[PDB]
């Protein structure tokens, strides 16, 4: 054709982590929550099929799948770790998904809680008409 398209989508990955007043019965010291969302309350479900959070193997059932927003996991724990996150698209071509290795870090007692935000730009060059329609509703 005479024309081509490049679509850019912004994602926000982030987490909050707080030292518990009182450890859990297992002795877990922190409460945390990790999330994937669009910026400024934008709807990313238009183009996201699901978000898979791969927790550390010490967690029971570490593969946590979110098929609907909010795309998040809340847990209690004792150590920070790398958390691979897979964002799956409502796309029939490539790419079908994208992966981010998210640093789920915790702060020691006596320091402010963690409130971290990580911004990611995705670029889709010449998506299918169908995927383009989904991306550009978001």
């Amino acid at each position: 054709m005479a024309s081509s398209c490049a679509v850019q989508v912004k994602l926000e990955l982030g987490h909050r982590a707080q030292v518990r007043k009182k450890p859990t019965v297992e002795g877990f010291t922190h409460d945390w929550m990790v999330f994937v969302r669009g910026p400024e309350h934008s709807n990313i479900q238009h183009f996201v099929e699901k978000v898979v959070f791969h927790l550390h193997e010490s967690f029971p059932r570490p593969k946590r799948v979110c098929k609907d927003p909010p795309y998040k996991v809340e847990e209690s724990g004792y150590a920070g770790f790398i958390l691979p996150i897979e964002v799956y698209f409502k796309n029939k071509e490539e790419p079908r998904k994208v992966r981010f290795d998210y640093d789920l870090f915790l702060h020691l007692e006596g320091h402010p809680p963690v409130n971290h935000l990580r911004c990611e730009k995705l670029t889709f060059n010449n998506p299918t008409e169908d995927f383009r329609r989904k991306l550009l509703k978001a």
């Binding site: 010291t29 922190h30 550390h56 010490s58 004792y78 150590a79 920070g80 770790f81 870090f105 915790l106 702060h107 020691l108």
Partner: peptide, 5 residues
């Protein structure tokens, strides 16, 4: 930061 695993 706390310890890691």
């Amino acid at each position: 930061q706390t310890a890691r695993k």
